[PDB]
């Protein structure tokens, strides 16, 4: 305890402690910082004779060399329990809402914990109805499993996440946790607050069943780096007691980018495109905690931001192996005014199994992929030679594929702000029936423009009849 700061390189602070009182690897140290408020850093490395390198998790732009640092002796401890329900927290577990601080009697748990062992893993999963045609058909949202959407900058990751929360947050059957790691505080939060506080479940709002940890784009790298772990610690308590948890982490990428900035300031040898050497291990340590165990289940939905539009970037490439369901949003689809923007051929799911999801659902999904695979195989021929050169059955498959592309589009209840289309909730059964009817041949006479921004097939037929 009672060290002194030696160097301040960015948000990385090197501090010298007594020889026999060096802080451990993940302990939390504190700069008094004056004014009655302190800066909580987290140790990352031990460099020698009492020298430790830590991450500020704060502004760290007004403190000098030689400032004293006090070693708490424990890692970051965040409140857990029902006291955290309906409250908004920092990475440090300190509430930022107007309500008072969490009481001392509330249990404090470290944000660094071992992930569930191999024994505790629960491999049982079942389909989770979400009301989105493309998600419930091509890449089913998995109950008790890990799923994520990989989208570029211009695609609607936020819109899809908000629609998912609106659809599945009223009938939770349990509590929920939302982590806003590296996301806009305009929409990513403070309007999810408006939507979550407005939604009511039998006189109890959805916000009353939600623990929200933020650490968004404005925060320094340390906060964005450890906010995910804080949210996981707050959700693991509810999972361990048996309560089902809906976990919504935002931009797991932003979690990885911060790790990259922290590693760059820490002097580690860079790997690939400036990323940290310990990318896979950090991703594993965060993600293996997001697991449904035999004591409780976590239904996790994540977002991932692809830099530029490169799906081969190390961060999404590392995420891809940690998911049960993958949903790929493409800019090319989005620029076609297909706001769901999901690419059916690049979106998969583990529970898309005839034993799990149903024989008819499986057959319909496989056919809806075989079509649009025939379309992707013929994109260049249509581009250069044109539609005429294809055979008759190839023309039919291409027409059905383009109709299917238009039909995957669907208005969202949270999209009324900039789109005039009222939102639509299509059950999985209706989606399967609509796509089976479309594949059979019903709707061939219908022009493709009538499949755009519609619900099930009955809505398309009604629109066609209205157009006569």
């Amino acid at each position: 305890a009672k060290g002194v700061i030696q160097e301040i390189i960015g948000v990385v602070i090197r501090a010298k402690f007594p020889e026999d009182e060096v802080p451990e690897i993940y302990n939390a140290i504190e700069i008094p910082l004056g004014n009655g408020d302190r800066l909580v850093c987290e140790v990352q490395q031990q460099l020698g004779n009492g020298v430790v390198k830590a991450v500020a998790m704060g502004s760290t732009d007004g403190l000098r060399r030689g400032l004293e640092v006090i070693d708490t002796g424990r890692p970051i401890a965040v409140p857990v329990g029902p006291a955290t329900l309906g409250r908004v927290f920092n990475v440090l577990g300190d509430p930022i809402d107007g309500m008072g601080p969490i009481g001392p009697e509330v249990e404090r748990r470290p944000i660094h914990r071992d992930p569930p062992s191999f024994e505790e893993q629960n491999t049982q999963a079942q389909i989770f109805e979400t009301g989105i045609k493309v998600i419930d058909l091509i890449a089913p949202f998995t109950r008790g499993g890990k799923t994520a959407i990989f989208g570029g900058a211009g695609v609607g990751k936020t819109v899809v996440i908000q629609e998912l929360i609106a659809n599945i947050a009223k009938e939770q059957s349990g509590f929920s946790v939302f982590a806003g790691v590296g996301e806009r505080s305009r929409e990513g939060n403070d309007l999810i607050h408006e939507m979550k506080e407005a939604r009511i479940d039998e006189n109890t709002t959805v916000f009353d069943k939600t623990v929200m940890v933020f650490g968004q784009m404005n925060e320094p790298p340390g906060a964005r780096l450890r906010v995910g772990l804080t949210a996981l610690t707050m959700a693991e308590y509810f999972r361990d007691e048996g309560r089902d948890i809906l976990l919504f982490i935002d931009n797991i990428f932003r979690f990885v980018q911060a790790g990259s900035e922290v590693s760059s300031l820490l002097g580690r040898m860079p790997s690939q495109v400036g990323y940290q050497p310990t990318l896979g291990t950090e991703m594993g340590e965060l993600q293996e905690r997001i697991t449904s165990t035999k004591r409780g289940s976590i239904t996790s939905m994540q977002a991932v931001y692809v830099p530029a539009d490169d799906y081969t970037d190390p961060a999404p490439a590392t995420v891809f192996s940690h998911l049960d369901a993958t949903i790929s949003l493409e800019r090319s689809i989005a620029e076609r005014a297909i706001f769901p923007a999901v690419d059916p051929l690049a979106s998969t799911s583990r529970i898309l199994d005839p034993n799990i999801v149903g024989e008819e659902h499986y057959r319909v999904a496989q056919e809806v992929k075989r079509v649009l695979q025939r379309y992707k195989d013929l994109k260049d021929i249509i581009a250069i030679l044109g539609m005429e050169e294809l055979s008759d059955e190839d023309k039919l498959t291409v027409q059905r594929a383009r109709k299917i592309e238009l039909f995957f589009s669907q208005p969202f209840t949270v999209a009324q702000q900039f789109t005039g289309r009222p939102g639509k909730y299509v059950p999985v059964k209706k989606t399967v029936e609509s796509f089976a009817r479309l594949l059979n041949g019903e709707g061939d006479h219908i022009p493709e423009s009538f499949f755009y921004m519609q619900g099930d097939f009955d809505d398309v037929l009604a629109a066609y009849e209205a157009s006569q």
Binding site: M269, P270, V273, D380, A383, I384, L385, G386, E388
Partner: protein
């Protein structure tokens, strides 16, 4: 009709060549950037 179809196909092929040239140049710049970055990292 064949003359018109081949004129349209040639125009489409020229447009596709322009798009592929843009993509190839982007890939070339990315490859040079990656090469110099890894060479500088190995030197340092």
């Amino acid at each position: 009709a064949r003359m018109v179809a081949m004129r349209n196909a040639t125009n489409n092929a020229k447009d596709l060549v322009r798009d592929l040239t843009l993509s190839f140049n982007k890939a070339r710049q990315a490859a040079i950037t990656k090469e110099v970055s890894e060479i500088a990292s190995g030197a340092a």
